[PDB]
Amino acid sequence: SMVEADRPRFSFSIAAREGKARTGTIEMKRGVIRTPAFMPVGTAATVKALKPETVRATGADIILGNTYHLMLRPGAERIAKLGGLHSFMGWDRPILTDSGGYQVMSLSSLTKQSEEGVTFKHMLSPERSIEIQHLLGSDIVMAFDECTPYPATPSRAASSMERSMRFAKRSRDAFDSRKEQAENAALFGIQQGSVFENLRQQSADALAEIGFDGYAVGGLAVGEGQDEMFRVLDFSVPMLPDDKPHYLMGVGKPDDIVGAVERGIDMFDCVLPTRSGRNGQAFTWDGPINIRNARFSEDLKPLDSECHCAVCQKWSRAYIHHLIRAGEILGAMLMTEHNIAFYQQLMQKIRDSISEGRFSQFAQDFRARYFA
Amino acid sequence: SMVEADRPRFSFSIAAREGKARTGTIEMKRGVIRTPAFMPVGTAATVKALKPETVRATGADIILGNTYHLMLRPGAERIAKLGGLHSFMGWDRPILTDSGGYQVMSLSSLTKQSEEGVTFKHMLSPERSIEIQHLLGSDIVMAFDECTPYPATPSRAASSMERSMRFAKRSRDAFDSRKEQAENAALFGIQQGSVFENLRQQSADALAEIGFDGYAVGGLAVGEGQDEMFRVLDFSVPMLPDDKPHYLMGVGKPDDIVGAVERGIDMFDCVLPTRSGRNGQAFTWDGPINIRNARFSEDLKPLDSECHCAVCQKWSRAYIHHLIRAGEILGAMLMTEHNIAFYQQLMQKIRDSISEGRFSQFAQDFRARYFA
Ligand SMILES: [Cl-]
Ligand SMILES: [Cl-]
Ligand SMILES: [Zn+2]
Ligand SMILES: [Zn+2]
């Protein structure tokens, strides 16, 4: 039919649910994102040790671009002059960018947080963060906020949450005031409040009044331990709008992801598969292994016995053990490809199990084997 | 026809000639090698920063496996137990292995050369070198010799050449005494004699009396300068059997290769494209460039304007400049793939021009542009 014969800026659809868990899609102009989603991290315009085509071969639909490094070198204006981050690095699908503020605090010197933003050895305000993300050509822009250390007293957590909510409104208005950005990208707000239910509620209410395309749970990748993280998620995720994506920033280990999905999270990112891969840790369905251990020196099996990735089709543990011990670049490449593929296969199993109404059983089976 | 409906152990055929230059093929059980050939170097069971499929995509028909690192770690017996070097690293085509002796002298400590071979901090005799190369599963085995430093006095050059010829006979007999090796691999002898015509002649005569599948010109990648290298090649290559391959070990820069082919060399290896690629040097038809230079920070052109490699199809100088300056693994990967592809495209242009009787013109055109 003629009538049957482009993607929207942003459309999140939920296809299936089981308990608090959801599966569906985010459609954007640069592609579809299957949820729950894992985003590999690109630290300085590269997912370390992988060509973009290899990232895509693992199943990733979207990557996270750290802003902090790029705003320093090559610089946001320079990247824009060169055609934007997508062209520059050769990834044509969606990119979510962080605001830059957290890595300023973790990596910079002589930092000072204030109502104007953060200065460091350079000023990064909410408005400038949104502009930088625009210049990079981000598809999902994160509101600029003020981080809360862990542990935090109730007073400190309230102060940084309140400032973050003022910054969320400033971020909203800056994004909306740039027509090309408002029409082509999406903006996510970040819930704060440390581990305190009342502050988490105040933050969710403030963000919902402003209105965002998605809602992150901030402040939980900070050393609190899984029991506490899950306790906070238990009350925090229900506070967010149900019909928008829920993004748990900086999480995490495979079992963290499974439990967070059980609590209503749709999106994840962390450096664990890439960074710990380069350090010799490989993820397997039977738990992580450190490939440098002497027990692998003559092990002809692949990293994981079921994994479908190209690394596991072609190379042995023994070979990868040799490469990592020798400091060879190919060792980093192979470990990273496998680990990112493992994470994507985890997400696929999560999505399929929710779609089939058997996610609770999947989670129990996953844990029993992973922690055996 | 029924009558028309495996490859030999070794068959070198010359399809075309121009002056002293030749083009043709070496057929072996694991594949065909197009000559003149460039062999990427695999230092520790990896061509640094490349999967084998990427090495093959550049056009390489054969790689060089350094023996020295592998005989120490993982060890030759261990590699054999794991199925041999080809299986271990995932390269199923021919591998030429060096003897290990030169890298003992260049990288080891407390070395001592004698009529038994070389001891170091471990003994490596001619017989043990051949055995190690067997355990790795080498397709082209290099005779074990004794290197000559540059400069060398006539007396020293004669002594090491004479010992090398005694070691060449020992290598021949060791190779022949191992039936599986003799039937499936090839053995090359190495001409020595430093820069001295009379010693080069004595060495060629000794090697021809023993008999080898191919003949290397040893001792010329040692700092002597191109004029002197070419002068020695002028008289040395004609001394070798015409109907066998001529291998110039450790050479070299693009213009070294062109001039060596003009003097009758069929095979080459060096670390320049890989090692200097990781250091930021990219080869182009207009000469080498250092991609770290600030002049490339906003240059959207590919590394080379004509190169057919995947790197030049997909990424800019500006991006690769950023990666190398940032110390990113992907920078090493992309520089290395391009440089090895450039070397293979050089070899292809050499082969085609000899096949078409226009190699002299190619060499003159190549130099005029490369040194402009
Ligand atoms: Cl990383
Ligand atoms: Cl190298
Ligand atoms: Zn795998
Ligand atoms: Zn290229």
Domains, in order of start, for chain B: 11-269 (3.20.20.105), 277-364 (no CATH)
Comparing CB atoms, the residue among A49, A74, A300 nearest residue B297 is: A74
Contacts of B309 (CB under 8 A, 6+ apart): B58, B337, B338, B341, B342, B345
Please give the Cα distance from B306 to A129 (Å, whole number): 40
Q: What are phi and psi of B338, to 5 degrees?
A: -60, -50
Q: What are phi and psi of A356, to 5 degrees?
A: -105, 5
Active site residues of B: 98, 269
Task: Tell how far the Cα of A155 is from the centroid of ligand 3, in angstroms.
Answer: 47
For B5, the token pair is: 């409906």
- Bond before A8 cis per omega within 30 degrees: no
CA distance A322 to chain B (A): 7
SS3 letters for A25-80?
Answer: EEEECCEEEEECEEECEECCCCCCCCCHHHHHHCCCCCEEECCHHHHHCCCHHHHH
Please name the residue of chain B whose CA is at the shortest distance from the CA of residue A321: B74
Query: Which residues partner with B31 through β-bridges?
Result: B28
Instruction: Decide: B326 and A44 in contact? Cβ < 8 Å.
Output: yes
Please give the Cα distance from A22 to A116 (Å, whole number): 38
Nearest residue to B319 (alpha-carbon basis) of A49, A336, A332, A74: A74
Nearest residue to B312 (alpha-carbon basis) of B288, B286, B282, B332: B282
Ligand nearest to the CA of A64: 1
Return the H-helix or E-strand segment holding B141: strand B140-142
Q: Report the SS3 class of residue B11.
A: strand
Q: How many residues does chain B have?
A: 372
Comparing CB atoms, the residue among A297, A314, A329 nearest residue B329 is: A329
Query: Binding residue per annotation — B138?
Result: no
Please give the Cα distance from B298 to A1 (Å, whole number): 49
Please give the Cα distance from B299 to A82 (Å, whole number): 9
Q: What are phi and psi of A78, to 5 degrees?
A: -65, -45
For B110, the token pair is: 């407390």
Please give the Cα distance from B103 to B92 (Å, whole number): 25
Nearest residue to B323 (alpha-carbon basis) of A279, A273, A277, A48: A48
Instruction: Decide: B363 and B20 in contact? Cβ < 8 Å.
Output: no
Instruction: Decide: B9 and B186 in contact? Cβ < 8 Å.
Output: yes
- Positive or negative torsion for Cα B97, B100, B102, B104: positive
Q: What are phi and psi of B35, to 5 degrees?
A: -120, 145
Tell me, rounded to whole angstroms, the distance of Cα A84 from its chain centroid.
20
- According to DSSP H, which parts of chain B are helical? 52-57, 68-72, 76-81, 85-89, 101-107, 126-136, 154-176, 179-184, 197-210, 226-236, 254-262, 277-278, 310-314, 317-325, 329-355, 359-370
Please give the Cα distance from B91 to B62 (Å, whole number): 9
Contacts of A12 (CB under 8 A, 6+ apart): A24, A25, A26, A35, A213, A214, A243, A244, A245
Please give the Cα distance from B214 to B211 (Å, whole number): 9
Residues A42, A44, A47: CA angle, nearest 5 degrees = 30
Cβ distance of B69 and A297 shorter than 8 Å: no
CA distance A127 to chain B (A): 26
Please give the Cα distance from B39 to B28 (Å, whole number): 15
For A215, the token pair is: 């809602």
Chain B (143-202) residues lying within 8 Å, Cβ to Cβ, of chain A: none
Comparing CB atoms, the residue among A46, A298, A314 nearest residue B330 is: A46
Contacts of A213 (CB under 8 A, 6+ apart): A10, A12, A140, A186, A187, A188, A244, A245
Looking at the complex, does the CB of residue A314 fall below 8 Å from at least one CB of chain B?
yes
Residues of B in contact with A69 (CB under 8 A): 326
CA-only gyration radius of chain A, Å: 20
Return the H-helix or E-strand segment holding A344: helix A329-355
Looking at the complex, does the CB of residue B291 fall below 8 Å from at least one CB of chain A?
no
- Positive or negative torsion for Cα A311, A314, A316, A320: negative
Nearest residue to B72 (alpha-carbon basis) of B24, B10, B124, B30: B124
CA distance B44 to chain A (A): 8
Q: Solved by what technique?
A: X-ray
Task: Tell how far the Cα of B341 is from the centroid of ligand 4, in angstroms.
Answer: 6
Please give the Cα distance from B166 to B125 (Å, whole number): 12
CA-only gyration radius of chain B, Å: 20
CA distance B165 to chain A (A): 35
Tell me which DSSP letter residue B44 carries: S
For A258, the token pair is: 């499974």
Please give the Cα distance from B46 to A323 (Å, whole number): 8
Q: DSSP for A148-178?
A: --SS--HHHHHHHHHHHHHHHHHHHHHHHTS
Q: How many residues does chain A have?
A: 372
Residue from A55, A319, A320, A337 to probe the interface with B (highest B Cβ count within 10 Å): A319
Instruction: Decide: A35 and A24 in contact? Cβ < 8 Å.
Output: yes
Instruction: Decide: B189 and B212 in contact? Cβ < 8 Å.
Output: yes
Q: Report the SS3 class of residue B17.
A: strand
Please give the Cα distance from B203 to B200 (Å, whole number): 5
Nearest residue to A176 (alpha-carbon basis) of A141, A137, A136: A141
Task: Tell how far the Cα of B273 is from the centroid of ligand 2, in angstroms.
Answer: 8
CA distance B281 to chain A (A): 18
Residue owning tokens 């993004």 = A247
Ligand nearest to the CA of A310: 3
Please give the Cα distance from A159 to A192 (Å, whole number): 10
Nearest residue to B84 (alpha-carbon basis) of B30, B128, B149: B30
Please give the Cα distance from B67 to B101 (Å, whole number): 9
Task: Tell how far the Cα of A305 is from the centroid of ligand 3, in angstroms.
Answer: 8
Cα separations in angstroms, B133 against B121, B181, B230: 20, 9, 31
- Indicate if A139 belongs to the active site: no
Amino acid at B195: V
Contacts of B131 (CB under 8 A, 6+ apart): B76, B174, B178
Please give the Cα distance from A227 to A247 (Å, whole number): 19
Nearest residue to A249 (alpha-carbon basis) of A271, A231, A227: A271
Comparing CB atoms, the residue among B44, B83, B325 nearest residue A326 is: B44
Please give the Cα distance from A214 to A35 (Å, whole number): 13
Q: End-to-end CA distance of chain A, in Å?
A: 55
Please name the residue of chain B whose CA is at the shortest distance from the CA of residue A325: B73
Contacts of B284 (CB under 8 A, 6+ apart): B303, B304, B305, B307, B342
Instruction: Decide: B330 and A329 in contact? Cβ < 8 Å.
Output: no
Looking at the complex, does the CB of residue A73 fall below 8 Å from at least one CB of chain B?
yes
Instruction: Decide: B288 and B339 in contact? Cβ < 8 Å.
Output: no
- Bond before B40 cis per omega within 30 degrees: no
Residues of A in contact with B326 (CB under 8 A): 44, 69, 73
Please give the Cα distance from A360 to A263 (Å, whole number): 11
Q: In what order do the strands lie in the sheet with B117-119?
A: B112-114, B117-119, B123-124
Please give the Cα distance from A172 to A176 (Å, whole number): 6
Tell me which DSSP letter residue B276 carries: I
Looking at the complex, does the CB of residue B72 fall below 8 Å from at least one CB of chain A?
no
Residues of B in contact with A318 (CB under 8 A): 74, 82, 88
For B196, the token pair is: 């001295």
Task: Tell how far the Cα of A117 is from the centroid of ligand 3, in angstroms.
Answer: 42
Largest CA distance in chain B: 65
Instruction: Decide: B67 and B136 in contact? Cβ < 8 Å.
Output: yes
Please give the Cα distance from B166 to B164 (Å, whole number): 5
Residue owning tokens 């608090």 = A20
Instruction: Decide: A367 and A255 in contact? Cβ < 8 Å.
Output: yes
Residue owning tokens 């062109």 = B258
